[PDB]
Every structure is written in structure tokens, then in C-alpha cells.
Structure 1
Amino acid sequence: APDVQDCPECTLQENPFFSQPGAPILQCMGCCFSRAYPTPLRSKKTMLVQKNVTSESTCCVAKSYNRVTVMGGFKVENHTACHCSTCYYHKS
């Protein structure tokens, strides 16, 4: 691709704190790319209807965690797995 749209590939960003010769904690951080597709609808009311987002801020709430609460009681849910989308409350 031309570039990276200033966004990496959603995943774990190994804890730059807990990372030690035997324990490289994490913290899912990145971008899960985007999947948009324009479609010529009808739009009842004004030119547009209701509010809609471009959809890109995908959430990969670690599918699985190995949580290793660090400094200030951090929580890297020592991510063992990360799955974009599916959050505790989408649309916000």
C-alpha cells in the first residue's frame, strides 16, 4: 500500500515497563485498518439522516488476557489474544 494511513496493525504493544528477561507484558495498541463502502441510498430527511461515523476505530479488546497489573495498578490483561470490534459498548 502507498503507506500506513498513520495507523499500525491492531495488536499488543508489549508493555515497555513489565518487559523483562522473562516477562514481556503487553497492551493491545494499534489500528485494525478500515472497511468502508459508500452506497447511494435515499436519505429521508435532510440530505442525510441521523448521525453516522466513518467506522475505523476498531476495538480489539484482547480476546484473552494474562493481566499483569503494573505501576499505578496498570492492566495489560497481558493480552494473549486480540480481536478487533466487539466492545463493551460500540458507538461512542
Structure 2
Amino acid sequence: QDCPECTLQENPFFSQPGAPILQCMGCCFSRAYPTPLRSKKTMLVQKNVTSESTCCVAKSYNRVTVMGGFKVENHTACHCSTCYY
């Protein structure tokens, strides 16, 4: 199949007419392969597979409160970047 480009989306639950709350959502690239021996001699905890990725993340956003409470943020631009943790 094909996966949808990382791009801004209308958060349909925080979006009010005249004021849409935008959310970066999409697909980015990732590969998983048997970890190189090179890698194996640098790691303390050996892990058999090495994962390389990027996740759909906001290049820029705006902290914004909405619908009374909801402290939310407005994704203004997207990109394939770190998946972090």
C-alpha cells in the first residue's frame, strides 16, 4: 500500500469554525535490519536488530488554549524527524 505524506491535519475535536487546530500527521521512512557487527562492538546491550526511523513531527507549533480549558498546540509545519523516547 501507500502511506500518507507527513502534513498538517485538521484536529476535528479541537477545531472550531474560524479557528482550526492543526496537527502534523503522516508517514515517514524507517528501515530495520540486522545490526552490523561494527554496531555490536559499540553497544553494551546487544540488540539483534537496528532500527532507523523518522516520525511525523511538527517543525513548528503554537501553544494555544481552546474551548474553555484545552491547553493545546497548533502545528504550523510538519516534517519527518526524530522519533524520540
TM-score, normalised to structure 1, is 0.52
**Relative to structure 2, which stretch is displaced further, 16-25 or 27-36?**
27-36
Q: Compare the two structures and name the one with the higher strand fraction.
A: 2
- Give me the whole-angstrom Cα distance separating, in 2, the residues matched to 1:87 and 1:44: 22
Which structure is higher in RCO with an 8 Å CA cutoff and minimum separation 6? 2
List runs of 5+ in structure 1 lacking aligned partners. none
Deviation at 1:21, TM superposition (A): 2.8
Q: Which deviations, in whole Å up to 9, do the C-alpha atoms of 1:25-47 show, x marking residues without a partner?
A: 12211212456899998998999
Q: Secondary structure at the match of 1:42?
A: helix
Q: Secondary structure at the match of 2:15?
A: coil
Cα separation, partners in 2 of 1:54 and 1:41, compared to 1, 3 Å: closer
Deviation at 1:20, TM superposition (A): 2.8
- Give me the whole-angstrom Cα distance separating, in 2, the residues matched to 1:61 and 1:47: 28
TM-score, normalised to structure 2, is 0.55
Residue correspondences, number: 85
